[PDB]
Symmetry: C3
Subunit: 263 residues, 3 copies
């Protein structure tokens, strides 16, 4: 199957034309949209969403990831193979930073085989349709990776301050704010569990100059309606939520904001 | 096939990983999204959307319904088979109220067979992915109902105000993209008011009253005018031709409406 | 395959039931959503989106186009085949204006064969589900065009001002999610050369913009004029929102001077 992730939006016809190109190449291709609502050009956000979603896709899955503000420039178009046997077709702009770091890099190829393109002369600003989609389509069809082009020894990496445990607390950043307003950080709940904390404990969540108390719980309903809670999200990350409410509003936080959780 | 309905939104990756899990259990599963934009936690809205959508799905359809604010709590995870031969995989929180009342209940099973789960250790807040989705996939693929778990004799029901005639009185059930206001009032029940097409009735919402023409199509009235008619599911719906009824009437779902 | 375009939105269950209907007629039907977020009743916007998307769909593609404010009225329901071998199932309200003009019309049939319907008695306001969807499904299965109904020798046309060159002038056709402003001006006509700086006039205000190939060819936040993925001249702000910066909306007149 092909996992599809972009910042194109479902309002425009861009997603549909890319799917048409894929289906023209392989009528039997299975395309699963991860999301097409990544905020415009937000590669940092996309890198996180990609990793978390990839955890639920099987080995051999080909991911079409296109959040490409540098489309048409000298930035490289690449295909990465992670040590967990998954494939990623994307621009070399750092969007593959998290999967590369979490799964390990097995091999990286630059897309040079023009025979895999949808058009002889790709549009200057829509490589997603003319280069990335068809390449993902061919790979998902059995095309050997080596046929995409020559290997690369490096790839662009997004500078990120790794979440660490230091003196009774864990420091990190807000990675994703979902539809409910739940605030998921880049702090692994396992890392958080090294602060010798447990469900039913109460910890302090610090955002900027504010400090909130929050119960460590398993489910939203484990606290009264409207109350804050700290729990592990579906991908194993520490998330802050408000039962039947919006944590991003209560904390007044947005993606990228530094967040601290004291024991 | 599988009818998918949630309050997860299409912006998050939640819907995609759920479909991936389903596709992993059954590569040829046909998944049709009813909607994933149900307002967060709004089980009442979902209960109506579910029923109206189900009317166009064939018998044997397995519906995956997940608007589950109680995920991870003691609330039951169930599978309901209605008398019209449709199956519903959902939390026991009242979201299946309308399909239960309209189609009647044939059987109810509590999801207990852990071998039907996606992961050995289900997440505390994403049963949609770890329990409901895979169970819906297995069911849509043949799995006998008895393989789900023990039977249940009752299910949580959403308290509702059954629409009656005496004028007609009901509630706004769904406000769609266009702002059309669909009620829980069957258009047939309304016709038992000696009313007829072309007649002008009065719409009473809150403390305001409007004049509305009984018509068949939006274009049967001048642009911007209010009309009362049967929507695609047989329910009385109020709309503004080339306009937004919800804005004009300044009404929201759950709102009580009166037609004299 | 079927290209699906409407103004129904993805929030409502309408799109879903329409797809269920297509699938019941043909379980193997391949449905590709072009968009369901066309502004309500905006047939003009839909006509441009339909054409631009259709350029990337193969011949023999069946397009289900339903932006039908006149649903339930005397407006005709039709099936149009264009000379580029694509089929369009839609209301006769001008939504097919652009594909008809750009590709040329091969034939038009009024939908009269009721055996192609979803139900004997179609709803008054959801022909998308009861008439258009099933018809598109059948055509996609190989149903001969002559089996749809009788031929029509005309169709409703949305009058439109054609862009020119004298500096060139045109109108904003589509503003995408990024805020990029795509016009109805073919970038070929426009072709001045890349790297030159031109003037963009949007009513009373004027802006300077670089003619470039990639958004990144200018500095962050700067304006550029380039060909979009369909070949139309588009105005964009690198890493920004041109629609906001230019304070323009679809339908607005746009001028570009050397
Ligand atoms: N105005 C813009 N500035 C920079 N990048 C853009 C702009 N519009 C679209 N893109 C990028 O084009 C890519 C698709 O080719 C998208 O992933 C998007 O990030
Ligand atoms: N902050 C929250 N409070 C209560 N329920 C929630 C919250 N966030 C998500 N959910 C529920 O989790 C379910 C998915 O597991 C969704 O159907 C949603 O209703
Ligand atoms: N209030 C309304 N006025 C006019 N047309 C409408 C209204 N609501 C829905 N429609 C049309 O009904 C069609 C679907 O049957 C849609 O394409 C939409 O344009």
């Amino acid at each position: 199957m092909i996992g599809f992730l972009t910042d194109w939006g479902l309002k425009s016809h861009y997603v549909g034309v890319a799917k048409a190109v894929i289906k023209r190449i392989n009528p039997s291709a299975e395309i699963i949209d991860i999301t097409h609502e990544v905020e415009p050009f937000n590669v940092r956000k996309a890198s996180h969403v990609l990793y978390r979603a990839s955890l639920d896709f099987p080995p051999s899955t080909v991911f079409l990831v296109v959040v490409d503000y540098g489309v048409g420039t000298s930035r490289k178009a690449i295909v990465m193979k992670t040590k967990n046997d998954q494939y990623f077709v994307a621009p070399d702009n750092g969007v593959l930073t998290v999967v590369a770091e979490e799964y390990g890099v097995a091999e990286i190829r630059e897309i040079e085989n023009r025979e895999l393109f949808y058009k002889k002369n790709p549009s200057f600003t829509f490589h997603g349709r003319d280069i990335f989609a068809p390449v993902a389509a061919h790979l998902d069809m059995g095309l050997p990776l080596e046929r995409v082009g020559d290997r690369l020894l490096s790839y662009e990496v997004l500078k990120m301050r790794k979440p660490v445990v230091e003196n009774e607390k864990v420091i990190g950043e807000v990675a994703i704010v979902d539809t409910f307003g739940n605030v998921s950080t880049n702090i692994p709940f396992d890392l958080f569990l090294k602060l010798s904390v447990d469900f039913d404990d109460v910890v302090r969540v610090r955002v900027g100059r504010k400090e909130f108390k929050a119960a460590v719980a398993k489910a939203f309903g484990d606290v009264d309606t409207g109350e804050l809670l700290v729990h592990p999200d579906s991908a194993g990350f520490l998330e802050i939520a408000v039962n039947l409410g919006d944590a991003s509003q209560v904390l007044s936080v947005k993606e990228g904001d530094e967040i601290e959780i004291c024991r």
